[PDB]
């Protein structure tokens, strides 16, 4: 019923219980880089429009913890990027949106923390904070093409109607 994870390589890594996959990045970020184009970002956004209505969701896979994070951040990104007009100004707003110290799992203030692994180690915190920030920044470039329309340069009304929904009835911004 619900759309579970995809692209689980056998030889991966599980810092916390995230799954580090290759991502086509162009801003910054220490990470393994990508040789193909079908990253988990473009795969996750393709699944976005059907998942917002699902209130119950099974934790099938480790890399499913990647889909619970991106899909929960695109909700906030659509919520913020509503009243802007210009594509360039909206792009600047999403670029500055990535520069924010959101609470990673493992500290109070992060909701839905019951299904997460606590990085008690001294080393996991910095890599988790780096990569979740990198992912939240990287989503903006690919969201810019689709949030606005190319013919008239306003937010399309089709995209700006999954704004009041919350995946599993609990959003990041408490």
């Amino acid at each position: 019923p619900a759309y579970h994870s995809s692209l689980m390589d056998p030889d991966t890594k599980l810092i916390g219980n995230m799954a580090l996959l290759p991502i086509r990045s162009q801003f910054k970020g220490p990470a393994p880089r990508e040789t193909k184009d079908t990253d988990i970002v473009d795969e996750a956004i393709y699944y976005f429009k059907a998942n917002v209505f699902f209130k119950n969701y099974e934790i099938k896979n480790e890399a499913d913890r990647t889909l619970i994070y991106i899909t929960l951040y695109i909700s906030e990104c659509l919520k913020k990027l509503q009243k802007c007009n210009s594509k360039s100004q909206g792009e600047k707003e999403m670029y500055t949106l990535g520069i924010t110290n959101f609470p990673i799992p493992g500290e109070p203030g992060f909701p839905l923390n019951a299904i997460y692994a606590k990085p008690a180690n001294k080393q996991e915190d910095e890599v988790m904070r780096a990569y979740l920030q990198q992912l939240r920044q990287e989503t903006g470039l690919r969201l810019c093409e689709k949030v606005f329309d190319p013919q008239n340069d306003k937010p399309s009304k089709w995209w700006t109607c999954f704004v009041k929904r919350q995946f599993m009835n609990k959003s990041l911004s408490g």
């Binding site: 759309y3 393709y46 699944y47 429009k49 059907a50 089709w158």
Partner: peptide, 10 residues
């Protein structure tokens, strides 16, 4: 399936 129809609409 829902995803294919959502893709076909856009």
């Amino acid at each position: 399936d829902l995803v294919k129809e959502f893709n076909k609409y856009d």
